[PDB]
Amino acid sequence: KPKLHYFNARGRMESTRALLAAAGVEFEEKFIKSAEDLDKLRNDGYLMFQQVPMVEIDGMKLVQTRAILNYIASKYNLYGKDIKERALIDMYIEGIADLGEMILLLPVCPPEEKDAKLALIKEKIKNRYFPAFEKVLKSHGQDYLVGNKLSRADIHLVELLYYVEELDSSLISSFPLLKALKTRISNLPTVKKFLQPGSPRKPPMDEKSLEEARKIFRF
Amino acid sequence: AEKPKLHYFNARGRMESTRALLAAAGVEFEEKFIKSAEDLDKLRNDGYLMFQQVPMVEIDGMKLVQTRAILNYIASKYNLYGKDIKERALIDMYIEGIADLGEMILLLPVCPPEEKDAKLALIKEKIKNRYFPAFEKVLKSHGQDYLVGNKLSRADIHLVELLYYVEELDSSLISSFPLLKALKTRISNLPTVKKFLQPGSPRKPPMDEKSLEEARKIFRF
Numbered sequence A: 001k002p003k004l005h006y007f008n009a010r011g012r013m014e015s016t017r018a019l020l021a022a023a024g025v026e027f028e029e030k031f032i033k034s035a036e037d038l039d040k041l042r043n044d045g046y047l048m049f050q051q052v053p054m055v056e057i058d059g060m061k062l063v064q065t066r067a068i069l070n071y072i073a074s075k076y077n078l079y080g081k082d083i084k085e086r087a088l089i090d091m092y093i094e095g096i097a098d099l100g101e102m103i104l105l106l107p108v109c110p111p112e113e114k115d116a117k118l119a120l121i122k123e124k125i126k127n128r129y130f131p132a133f134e135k136v137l138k139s140h141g142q143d144y145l146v147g148n149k150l151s152r153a154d155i156h157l158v159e160l161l162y163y164v165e166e167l168d169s170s171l172i173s174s175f176p177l178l179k180a181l182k183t184r185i186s187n188l189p190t191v192k193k194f195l196q197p198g199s200p201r202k203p204p205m206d207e208k209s210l211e212e213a214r215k216i217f218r219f
Numbered sequence B: 001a002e003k004p005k006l007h008y009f010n011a012r013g014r015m016e017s018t019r020a021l022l023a024a025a026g027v028e029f030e031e032k033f034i035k036s037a038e039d040l041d042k043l044r045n046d047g048y049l050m051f052q053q054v055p056m057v058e059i060d061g062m063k064l065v066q067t068r069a070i071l072n073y074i075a076s077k078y079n080l081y082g083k084d085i086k087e088r089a090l091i092d093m094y095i096e097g098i099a100d101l102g103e104m105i106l107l108l109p110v111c112p113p114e115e116k117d118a119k120l121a122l123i124k125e126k127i128k129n130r131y132f133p134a135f136e137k138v139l140k141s142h143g144q145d146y147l148v149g150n151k152l153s154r155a156d157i158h159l160v161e162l163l164y165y166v167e168e169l170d171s172s173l174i175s176s177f178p179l180l181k182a183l184k185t186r187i188s189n190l191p192t193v194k195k196f197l198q199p200g201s202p203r204k205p206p207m208d209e210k211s212l213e214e215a216r217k218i219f220r221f
């Protein structure tokens, strides 16, 4: 069983949790609670650049989010059939990541910039990203983004749509193919089970999770 | 068929790492220099940019946008991404740390003037105390000429590229890392990297104030 080192929160670990779950892979979590808990991992030599996420899998101590996901994805045949496929898959998920990152960091944002940035994210969603993934689906009219078959692109995209729904339920409304993907994916039995209460799925980060984060990561 | 074609402004930015990867692999490419807000708008209205942004590279029938999507493709094609899934893990771990420090250096110019000093002081701390030791430790782990699999890889090329920008910022920084020093000399001497380094190659100057202005007009920031 792979073993995930992170604090109890979404952060930069959630796309790994959701991709393990979708692959039907069972896993352990070791939760950092304090800054003493992080420093213990550092000291023990466990963290290449002294940072989490880290995952123990197949005898490596794999740090860096993209290093973790690229590996999980090949292992479980969620990374396409060849390097042209990987290429489309990579173009899509990096664009997802780019929006992902704007959402992820919105609460560590200085208070006086908060309104501006939320506004910009919504416009980007409406004008940049959703039209881009709607035009891919419409292009081929298939059930999956790439290769008429399940990949990490579907998993990362649908994950992200849940996060946008929590922001504004109106945003997706003029994107019918995006809605239809959301449903179909959320109905795959492994994804359905992750979305169910009681799973490892993590909630949005409230104020006191943010505070525990400033404590442990010292920002 | 077709040389690859690179769409960017005339500057390092986010295109440079691709320039250095393709030339290291001995791969010739064309370059089309974006020079104005209107030039960018043309490529948007022609349907050329998946997210309306550059870098974009035409290669093998594709219009690849996103640095990492372009680099992963080029690396794979010319056998610079290890020999298996496990080698590809170690490569990605290393080159994502390089990207992290890489990002810090790139966005240095667009800092507010009052924070510039604190944020140079901080780059410098992490280099000395986090990033340089981690790479030195790897090289010392196996005593081998390359970072991964004792065979030339994209991590070697990205680390050495970055080794150059750490030097234009401060020469004293790499000077307590003998193994990083040695790697830099070695890779710089391979025939294709040597030919990227010499005058008149597509290799780009450090970004200046003027060029920070043209970036502002073009990308509208």
Ligand SMILES: CCCCCCSC[C@H](NC(=O)CC[C@H]([NH3+])C(=O)O)C(=O)NCC(=O)O
Pocket (backbone or CB within 6 Å): A011, A012, A050, A051, A052, A053, A063, A064, A065, A066, A104, A105, A107, A108, A213, A217, B096, B100
């Ligand atoms: C609003 C959510 C914020 C949650 C906290 C940030 S994630 C914790 C942070 N880790 C990273 O920033 C890792 C970045 C790395 N590039 C990756 O993607 O894995 C860390 O250990 N930082 C500690 C350090 O740098 O010492």
Ligand SMILES: CCCCCCSC[C@H](NC(=O)CC[C@H]([NH3+])C(=O)O)C(=O)NCC(=O)O
Pocket (backbone or CB within 6 Å): A094, A098, B013, B014, B052, B053, B054, B055, B065, B066, B067, B068, B106, B107, B109, B110, B215, B219
């Ligand atoms: C200060 C010197 C560095 C200049 C950086 C600007 S690069 C231009 C920028 N492109 C991106 O940031 C794409 C990022 C993307 N994730 C990638 O890595 O390719 C852009 O098209 N901007 C236009 C837009 O997003 O609207």
